[PDB]
Structure formats: structure tokens, C-alpha cells
Design a binder for this molecule. Sequence first.
Ligand SMILES: Nc1ncnc2c1ncn2[C@@H]1O[C@H](COP(=O)(O)OP(=O)(O)OP(=O)(O)O)[C@@H](O)[C@H]1O
Ligand SMILES: Nc1ncnc2c1ncn2[C@@H]1O[C@H](COP(=O)(O)OP(=O)(O)OP(=O)(O)O)[C@@H](O)[C@H]1O
Ligand SMILES: Nc1ncnc2c1ncn2[C@@H]1O[C@H](COP(=O)(O)OP(=O)(O)OP(=O)(O)O)[C@@H](O)[C@H]1O
Ligand SMILES: [Mg+2]
Ligand SMILES: [Mg+2]
Lengths: 74, 148, 506, 59
Amino acid sequence: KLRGTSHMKGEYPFTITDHGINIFPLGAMRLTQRSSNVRVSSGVVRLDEMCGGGFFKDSIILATGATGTGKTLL
Amino acid sequence: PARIAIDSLSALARGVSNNAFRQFVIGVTGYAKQEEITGLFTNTSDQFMGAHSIADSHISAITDTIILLQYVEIRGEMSRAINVFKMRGSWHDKAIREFMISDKGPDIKDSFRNFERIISGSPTRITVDEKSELSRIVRGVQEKGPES
Amino acid sequence: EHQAIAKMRTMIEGFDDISHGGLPIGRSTLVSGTSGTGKTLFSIQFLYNGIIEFDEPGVFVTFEETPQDIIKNARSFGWDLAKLVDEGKLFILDASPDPEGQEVVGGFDLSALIERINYAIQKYRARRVSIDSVTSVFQQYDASSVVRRELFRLVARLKQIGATTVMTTERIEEYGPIARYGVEEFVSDNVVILRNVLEGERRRRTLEILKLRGTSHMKGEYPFTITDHGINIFPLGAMRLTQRSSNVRVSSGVVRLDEMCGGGFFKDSIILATGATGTGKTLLVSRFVENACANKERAILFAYEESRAQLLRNAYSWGMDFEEMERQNLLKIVCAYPESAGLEDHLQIIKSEINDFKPARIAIDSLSALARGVSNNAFRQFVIGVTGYAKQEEITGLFTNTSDQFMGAHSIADSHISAITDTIILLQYVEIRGEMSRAINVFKMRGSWHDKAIREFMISDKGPDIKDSFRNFERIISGSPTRITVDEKSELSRIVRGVQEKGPES
Amino acid sequence: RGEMSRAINVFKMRGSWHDKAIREFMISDKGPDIKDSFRNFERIISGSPTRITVDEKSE
Ligand SMILES: Nc1ncnc2c1ncn2[C@@H]1O[C@H](COP(=O)(O)OP(=O)(O)OP(=O)(O)O)[C@@H](O)[C@H]1O
Ligand SMILES: Nc1ncnc2c1ncn2[C@@H]1O[C@H](COP(=O)(O)OP(=O)(O)OP(=O)(O)O)[C@@H](O)[C@H]1O
Ligand SMILES: Nc1ncnc2c1ncn2[C@@H]1O[C@H](COP(=O)(O)OP(=O)(O)OP(=O)(O)O)[C@@H](O)[C@H]1O
Ligand SMILES: [Mg+2]
Ligand SMILES: [Mg+2]
């Protein structure tokens, strides 16, 4: 509590490093990520094709498969 | 960095609860998103052949591009296959291609067009009179054209 | 009103409903709660509202907080208690200890207080009294039996004096005894319990009226938030089932679809979009919202998965310029991580944004995004909330949902937000010849006829093109069908040989 | 054919290339004798195959 004003509620993880307390307000981060149309290769040309021109620079890529399929290769 | 890659988010999902995990995923996913950084995240689905779900953890919503590898039983053999499942901004190829792995890396080949139930891991070969109709002996209506 | 006891309104949004009318006059209400739950605020709002709305002078007895502080803090919600103390409508009776005091004084002061209070009530002709932290006074050195007596005496004199009182109390456990000395519960005429439940690192405040001697009231806990305007309660269970229902159709932003629904969606109707990840619910959402702006109607888009940038990069790539929809003050995009708060907060934000923009179309991209973490009932309560507020607001709405499993999903929603929905739009991936094609299906529509086929649909730069159904296929829904054929080559336009033209001419 | 026969398979090798065939193998007093692949079967992995016995192209 903070009689008089507002404040984020609940718990928030923090670490004590060689630079003191370090808190991450994972619930404070806003949904304002910049997004462009710029591409970027994958290292696999055929892939880049199937993705219609490569992975966007601004994007998260997830590779899912059974053990041994080859995610670590891509 | 301009690019980042964490091999196996699924390796970090060990022990930890699911929401604690999803919180981790939101963390290194957005931090990367705002920093402009391109990241490739890895996930080993708990079950080979039959996987009814992209991620057991259900993070396939906080992601933009999903790449899918999967074994395909072909004539007593374990062949791979690759499929760009979803891409939010581009068009991407809808084919479930097969692919080998050599010293050179990954050679993406073709799709198994003459099969059924490929996503299962144990397709069903089914040419049995391909795209040529039972009229492969073209009936015989063509017995008038050539004469003496 | 068929209740046996006269009540006074708190004018606190949502409380008067829960208590079927406000607080019983001439009686006393125990608002007890742990630390930082909103006790002072409730009691302060209780007097303020009584002054601002009914010209009822109020008395505020404070035992720990300083009169300057009570005034400094209330400015948090824009209240000038000073101007009121001044106009002589509000009188703060300071009974706090001295920063340089002694020890011993909690009984004759209980008689001196009674008399002090009576004096203030008589002087200011007060109708409402708040007593903040009565507990702190016996917190000098007392036991349950002494407390019961002193509380009773105080309360009993107040009743006689005619005053309608509110008394604050503390507690250490969120679910254990109501108040500290397990005696306050029984001496009060009414009991309101304020909680701040932890549960999975989040905080959820609730308000519950435990008892009201004389009338009934809503039972159980109720979620609420403290904002710049004080307490704000949501009686999610007082939400009746009397929404107006029109036969008015509206477009979905997709021509073929509207046909499929027998002529567009109903204005008054909740729409559900579900399919596997990547199927394209988010496209129909973009198309749904853009059409509200193509007819010069406002529309909000609460996004819980895509940033404000991406939503626009992707939207543009499908045609439709979101940049303009925003400028013409016709389309409003929100955006937020479900994690950035609790459902309560989220549901309010939504409610708010709906008032400050009078939409005619709302879209919540990914209910299942909000589904993250939250228990299933806490989620359904939310779904009842958003789906309800909208239905009674004539606001048409499109809700999205991502089924945890691509191909093979045996149910619409893993959550059962089915019966809560009027129209259901089901997308899925069909496995045909080594490739992943799409398949859209108008699963259900309550007042309409809607098309029964599971069509195939392509996603281009243009948008969603709804083709035809895989007639000659079985086990469709399975995800990977079996091609059986009684035909295929059957007419439609056989005529072999040279049928096409090529780029040159035709 | 109403018989419990085995099959061994090199599922994955991080370095090398390894074989991609599901091979039938027997056990005797000599040890493991890895035979051939059920090339003409389906759903081997499943465990209850189904021989295709495809009628060729049928001429
Ligand atoms: N030189 C090589 N030649 C042919 N195939 C190879 C070669 N190296 C590795 N492989 C094949 O690729 C696979 C390696 O998998 P990889 O290292 O790409 O990561 P993964 O499947 O994503 O994850 P994990 O290794 O934890 O199972 C092996 O299972 C094997 O079949
Ligand atoms: N403008 C505001 N916006 C949002 N929250 C506020 C605002 N002002 C105060 N709050 C919140 O309300 C709380 C104040 O509690 P309040 O002073 O009403 O009494 P209490 O918590 O019941 O009892 P105590 O005297 O032990 O603190 C703070 O903990 C804070 O989180
Ligand atoms: N410009 C485009 N051209 C062709 N296809 C596109 C284009 N943009 C998106 N797509 C297709 O649409 C899909 C995007 O999905 P969409 O944004 O409609 O929401 P969703 O699938 O319902 O949910 P989520 O995006 O969270 O997975 C991609 O998987 C892709 O196949
Ligand atoms: Mg690996
Ligand atoms: Mg989406």
C-alpha cells in the first residue's frame, strides 16, 4: 500500500547482482513494439522462399519438432 | 546483437511451472521485439509423430513465424519434412516438404503429394491409379483418325 | 421497495446494488479488511458522497492518520476535503495519540469520545459518521471481552444519537477471523469485508457484505478496483438477462461470409471465431473492424497478442489501411498483455474505453489470450462480463479464440464459452495432397439460417477469398481427410483441348 | 502375420549421418541379427502394420 497514490499491485521478480537490486516489471512492459516489412535470411534459401522472402527482421521465429528432427540445425 | 537464438525454450521449461514459463517467454520475446532484434526460438515437442499441438506450453500466440519439422514414416523409413506453419505478414509456402540432412546441411525437397495423413507421422501411400483416370487405356474411342 | 429497513446510499458505484440500496440508517457498519484494502477510502467516500450528493454533513473520527494526511491523500481522487471542512460540512475529529505521549487511556476516552462525537454531530448537524481504525485504540493492551463491551457501548450510543455509522477494522488473515478480536463481527449491525487476495503473484481485491440485520443483500465476494475515482464495484452476478434483441444485420467485412450467415451478423449478437494457430481469426477481426469504419461507425480493437505496429503492418499487407481508420477518428486500437493486470482491471478498462468512444462494434482479438493463467471460472466470469455488457449496449462484437490443437480439436472452445455465444465462426487446417489448405465454417447462428458447408479459403494481399467445399472428401474435420470420388471430372466445364489464353490476348 | 517380430532403428545422431530405416532384427544364441526393412508395410511405427500389396500400377 501507498496511502495517497497509485502503484502496481502484486509480486514482481527481482535479482540481486553486482549492481544491486534489479526488478523486472514483466507486467509493465507495453505492447508498443516497432514493426517493419524488412526481411532477413535464415541461412536456408529454400526456406527463405517458403517464407515468401525470408524472416522479417522484426519477428519471433519458433521451430518445433520431435527430438532429432533438426531444430538445432536451422 | 541483431539476431538471437535460444536453442530449446523447452529445455528451460524443465521443472518450472507453466505460467512461470509463459512469463519467461513473454520476457525474452518482447524485449527482443522492442529492441528490433530477430530471434529464433527452439522447441522439442514431447512426442515424435502424432503431435497434435505446436507447443505443449501454448506459446503459439506470442509468436509471429512458426516453423515445423516432423518425421514421416515412408516405406519402413524415417524421413523428415518441413512446413512453414504460419507467418503473420508474409504469404509463405503451404507445402509440407520433405528434406534430407548431409554434410552440406538441409536440402528441402518436395511435398508428399500422393499420400494421406502425413501430419500423423504414418502417412498412407495412395496412388492406386494416379491423375490419369481409369482411361489410361484411353477407351478406344480413338480408333478413328488413322486409316489406310 | 419491499425491504424492512431504511437505507442510505453510499453512491459508491456498485455498492448500493450489492447491499440492495446502501447502508441501513441509524445503524452501524463494520468495514473490516487487512492492510491496504481500501477501508479508509470506503469510509472517506462514504462521507464525501453524502456531502456532495445529499448535503449531509459528515463526521470523520481518525485514530491513527493525521487530519492533514486524510486531506492530503484524498486529493488522490480529486477531493477537496479542505473546502468542505471549511464550508463546515465535513468535520474531522482528531483523536490520534501524540508523538510525545504517555500510556493508558481507552475507556473514559470511550466516554469522552462518545461525548466528543455527540458534540460534533449536534454542532454540524451530522447525518453520517465514519470511525477509522477503532481497533487501534484497544491496541493499547486489551482482551476480547473488554473490546466487546467498549465497541457495544460506542455503537449503542451512536444508534441512540440517530447517526448512521461506518467503522473500520483490521485483520491479519484474508480468510480467517473477520476482525482482530473475533468480537467485532457480532456487535455490528452490518459487516462488510474487504479482501486483497494474493493467489499466483497477482492481487485481487473483493468486497463482500457478510451480514445486514433486517434486509437481504448480495451474498459472497465481489471484485473491485480502486481508481482515480475511488472504489469501483462490479456486481457481475446482478447482471440480469434482459438484453434487447434486434433482427438487424450488419456486415462482417467479408461479402461471401455475410452470405454464409444468411445476410451478415445480427447487430445484437456475440460472434465467436476459433481455429488453430495461423488459421486466420485475426484477419476476420481486421475485416470486421474496418467495415465499421467504411460505414462511418466507431469501433474498438482490444489487442492482447499483437503490438500496435504489427497489427498495422499485417493489416496493411491485407489491404485495409489502419492508419486512416485511426485518423478519421473511427477505429480505436487498444493493445495490452493479459499479464499486465487481472481480469477485473481488464474488464473495466474495456468498459471504460467503450464509454469514452461509444463504439457500435467491438472486437477482442484472442479471448484465449486473456485465458492465460486465470482459472477457468475466473475466465468464464470475464466472458460473461464482456459478452453481457456488450449485449445490453447493442454493441456488436467479435471474439477470437485459439484452440490449443491444430487439426483434431474435438471442441469449439477448451473453455465452453459456447452457450454464451450466438454465432460461431470456425476455421481449421485441412490436409490435402501434402499441403495445408484453410477451411472456414459457419458452425452456428441462432436467429439466422447460415450456410452448412465447410468451405476452403485462401489468404492473399487482397484478404480472405471464400472458395468452395471439399465435397468429394470424408473425415474433413479430422484434419487429414480421405479422398473418395463418385466423380470430380463431372462437368462444370470439361470441354478439353485449348481452353486458355495466356498473357498476350483473349 | 500373428507374430511378435522386432525392429531396431537409429532415431537420431547429433554428429554422424546414421541409417533412416526401420530394420527387423532377430535374437539367437549368437546375438542381435539386424535384418531388413518392412519396405512394403504401413504404420510400422504404430506397431500393427498393414501390408500394401499394391497391385503394381495394375499394368
Ligand atoms: N552430418 C550429418 N549427416 C546427416 N545427418 C545428420 C548429420 N548430423 C546430424 N544429422 C541428423 O540430424 C539430427 C540432429 O538434430 P539437431 O542437432 O539438428 O537438433 P534437434 O533435432 O532440433 O534437437 P536434439 O538434438 O536435442 O534432438 C540427427 O538426429 C540426425 O539424424
Ligand atoms: N488515485 C489512486 N488510484 C489507484 N489507487 C489508489 C489511489 N489512491 C490510493 N490508492 C490505493 O488505495 C489504497 C489506500 O487504502 P486506504 O487509505 O483507503 O485504506 P486501507 O488500505 O484500508 O487501510 P490502512 O489505513 O491500513 O492503509 C492504497 O494502498 C493504494 O493502492
Ligand atoms: N500478406 C499475406 N499474404 C498471404 N498470406 C498471409 C498474409 N498475411 C497473413 N497471411 C496468412 O494468414 C496467417 C496469419 O494469421 P492471422 O493473423 O490471420 O491470425 P490467426 O492465425 O487467427 O492467429 P495468430 O496470428 O495468433 O496465430 C498466416 O499464417 C498466413 O498463412
Ligand atoms: Mg538438439
Ligand atoms: Mg493472431
